[PDB]
Amino acid sequence: QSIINPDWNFEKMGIGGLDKEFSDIFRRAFASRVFPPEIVEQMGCKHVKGILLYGPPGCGKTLLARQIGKMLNAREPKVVNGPEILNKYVGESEANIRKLFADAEEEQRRLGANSGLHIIIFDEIDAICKQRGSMAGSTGVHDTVVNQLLSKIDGVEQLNNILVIGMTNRPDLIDEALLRPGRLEVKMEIGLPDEKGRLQILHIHTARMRGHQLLSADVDIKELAVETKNFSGAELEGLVRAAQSTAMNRHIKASTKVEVDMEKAESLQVTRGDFLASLENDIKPAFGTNQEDYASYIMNGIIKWGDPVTRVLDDGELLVQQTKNSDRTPLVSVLLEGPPHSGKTALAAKIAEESNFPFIKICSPDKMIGFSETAKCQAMKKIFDDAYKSQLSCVVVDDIERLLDYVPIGPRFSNLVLQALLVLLKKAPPQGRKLLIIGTTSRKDVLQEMEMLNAFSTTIHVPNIATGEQLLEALELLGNFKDKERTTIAQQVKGKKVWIGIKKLLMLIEMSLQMDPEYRVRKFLALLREEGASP
Template sequence: MAGRSGSKTMIVTNTPAKDLAYTNCAYCSPSDVRQFLLPGSNIALALVGDVFVLSIAAYDTIQSGQIGLNAIQRRHARVSTGDPVSVCRFIPPEDFNIALLTLELEFVKKGNKEEQVDAVLLAQQLRKRFVNQVLTSGQRVTFEYHGNGFIFTVTQVTVEGQDKSNNIERGMLVSDSYIVFEASNSSGIKIINQREAASSNIFRHKEFNLQSLGIGGLSAEFADIFRRAFASRVFPPHVASKLGVKHVKGMLLFGPPGTGKTLMARQIGKMLNGRDPKIVNGPEVLSKFVGETEKNVRDLFADAEQDQKTRGDQSDLHVIIFDEIDAICKSRGSTRDGTGVHDSIVNQLLTKIDGVEALNNVLLIGMTNRKDLLDEALLRPGRLEVQVEISLPDENGRLQILQIHTNKMKENSFLAPDVNLQELAARTKNYSGAELEGVVKSAVSYALNRQLSLDDLTKPVDEESIKVTMDDFVNALHEVIPSFGASMDDLERCRLNGIVDCGQRHDHIFKRTMLLTEQVKVSRGSPLVTVLLEGPSGSGKTAMAATVGIGSDFPYVKIISAESMIGLSEASKCAQIVKVFEDAYKSTLSIIVLDDIERLLEYVAIGPRFSNLISQTLMVLLKRLPPKGKNMLVIGTTSEVSFLDSVGICDAFSVTYHVPTLKTEDAKKVLQQIKVFSDDDIDAAAEALNDMPIKRLYMVVEMAAQGEYGGGAEAIYSGKETIQISHFYDCLQDIVRY
């Protein structure tokens, strides 16, 4: 922390000699200097009038108790000669060195003269002349350069390791501080070699704290973007020309919705020292008038073109951010609107980014959820060449995002001590950044709702008692479901009767299938494992597949069934199936259940008829390896294995397991677990259920439980009564076995 000590009042006097006015030092008697010396140093610093910090030098002619200030210093401190001023020793805090200093130049004597100032040489002179001096934002300093008297005003001070000082922008000038100069057009000062004055060291000292920018879990992606798109621009133009490279002029951020693409682009635009970025939503560019859309695109680049013509290499960087770029840059020839507007937009954009008169002072940032829709010419090197996937955050990334969104409530003591963000990060697999924000909002809504009374909404609210608890977050997790997560509701519906022990044969197949999930987790040689569960209708294949999906704890589990595609055309069904697989590729671990494959293929035995388009789609997807680092298990179920074998789909599965009907001993085990028969009747009922599929067993039991001879389903399932075996036989005879 900065310290003050020995505060005293001194009388203001003039600087003892004219040439000393250019040193920016304050002068006092040798006896007074000692009290301003820093411990263990010969540097003396003093805070003068609580306004600025000056280096103190000794001068024999100044009397004790006086301090010599030049005219600029007196004006800034609002004192005159003879006035008292408070002076105290200033001890600089740690990490006080200036990384970046921005100065505005003007002549001491205003006039019509003009002067070219070399920013590199001037920066060297100022660093040498004012080294170890403390400069404060707003401070004005006189200096002499090449026979001219100048004044610089400190407009920005950036201290190493932080964006700003705690309250006042202030820091110590050191030998490697970088100085950027500004001058108004009316000053008569023209600054040359400005870009050389600030090199990449600015960014080496000034850390980008992504968490403070509200970006969580994207540090690797941000480092990749910075290296490829900005590193060459940080260096002076002559360095890039000596290397013989051109700057990157475009980048594309793509990935699932809600992962932070727009946020990343917005913060990139803020962090650059160039002009404020132009943010364009794709559809806004479109116009119903012929040629108007292309003009809108040209207008976006007009400022950059003018800047490059007038300033050349000294031009500022112009950032243009295209949100939803797929709306206007679809692959040429793909739209059938008859106007060709989309094609001409792509052409216009291509010529602006990398045409004959290409601009070098533009950075185009495009964002999309559908990279596959973009014209391939846009994606080649020289155009949107830096393509960074902003994917779903990992556990550490999710923790960072949750910390960002709960930071304010933690600071203000609204977060209950039982909230464990680490546990929440572990439980929110495949949640995007936007969905995590939704979880926090939902949790807060539960906490706020506890403080409200629907009977009287005007009742005063006790702010102090608002606490967001772990239970609120757990409830929020049930409310905000991730788009790329496990479809637990769909999976649970596939096993309405729960899971019971169906005997050794079923248990063996279930354990084998669960072993495949472990193989997928750890395997490097088989990122795609496929298994087909075949057997008679109702034998429990779908329930088993759903149980494997739930028990796997994989972040992405989806079921593809014919019931979700009723009325769709073949092409639409294919697109929907492909989308589920494409979504799965965004997750590190995923399970897809292809339920009743023959129904998906629209198989009819008469004919026989089936959809070859869907069949070919499935065969391609079952053999296509997921992207690097992604592992997938596909579980198929079918009651028509001979048909699937005839069209070649069985060969696409790595493993096939036969799920059998229940034998007598298996049926007995099931009946013992559901406890609907008396001990005397179980053996007889199990014998009657030999070779029965598990689903049909449950149906017969349900029918018998409702029967008039029994005591009603409620009494039977509560254990008060049991099913009469005679009535059970009657129900069993009603069911036709095929």
């Protein structure tokens, strides 16, 4: 009797974007159980009896496990859902574990080489397979169970009709001894799909629904696939479900009571509008970008009041192009510096947005109020680790000076964060990927003295307003003072020089605007004069 079911077919499986992993798993697990036993005996080998999987949440682990379990024409697979074998009475946990393998042992001793096949699923293997303490005083809560499992999987007796599978999210906590090639040999990683993977996933989760004419011709599947970038597997299904629900909700109503129409429900259709709506406000990707942060950092937009803003943007674009289409330098960093209130964070955010990378994350101290240095180091480590799971990335560090906890008195600061950032600004990403880091600051000399400028590859300068003409141009662009007052103000500022940042100009304008209609110009001039220059 063949191991595989007579009618099994790959297309019925319903899996997309994991062809290579499935092929390798098949090759390493089942290839030896397909040809007649004579050749297998001649080669004198033993079948593998272990598998493992891991990855980030929502990638299709349980689905693959269940599919592989169903793919075999044998007994019904057992199941264990995390700590479901623990017990309070002494020694019962080990007896429970042993009970699982009794059937396989009996089968082997009875029928020998023609025995059947059995499967098991230690789902959440991490729950009861933590590393042994290996030290007196650190007795583990679950140690006898681990020892019993290790003994049974490969002990004084041999078995060749078993197969174990595991799934977890922390592959670095499993006991070391349980990962040698004799017990758990084949282990694979499940990652985020690619464009073709997303297309396949959307196609599989739509084929059926197209059977009964439930799709208008306005749905361009290729456009929908290309639009959604770096989406986990589950989120595509979530989007489709939400779109279907919102499309169906229009025919139904309720409010005071509940009722349903019967003359319109037979012409149900789903169009691209509902899809768009939901895509916008329904599913919030986890490894992507959203306009909320940009709206929070670009609150007042960007205005081209002179030449430097264009040069800065061009330099940013050049750096982005270099990192994107280069291979000898997979790590380039740029440091933005300038006087206070010069408006430097907004330019960084604009560059990051316009870069058009799949993944963008902003690490700012706003979310770390009152933390201890250990928490800050952990957060930075987590963010940088997360940034290592994409073919293109970009990270922005905001207000470095406030991150180091600097204070001129003493001076004082936190050394651990500085050491972590210094080590973390030279760690090349995993081979075959790219990265880009953009920083900001308001005190260049301090960093130059702490021996930090040898870690950054370049540097840009963001100046202030330098001449009355640029101030007048900015005022006109904002559109607050009209021509009549513009002439009077210009007649004054034109014959001198100014030194102010745009943010301070906005605040000054706002403060001035609160006075009487015909007293605004005088107070504005007085405030501008009192501001001073202080070169």
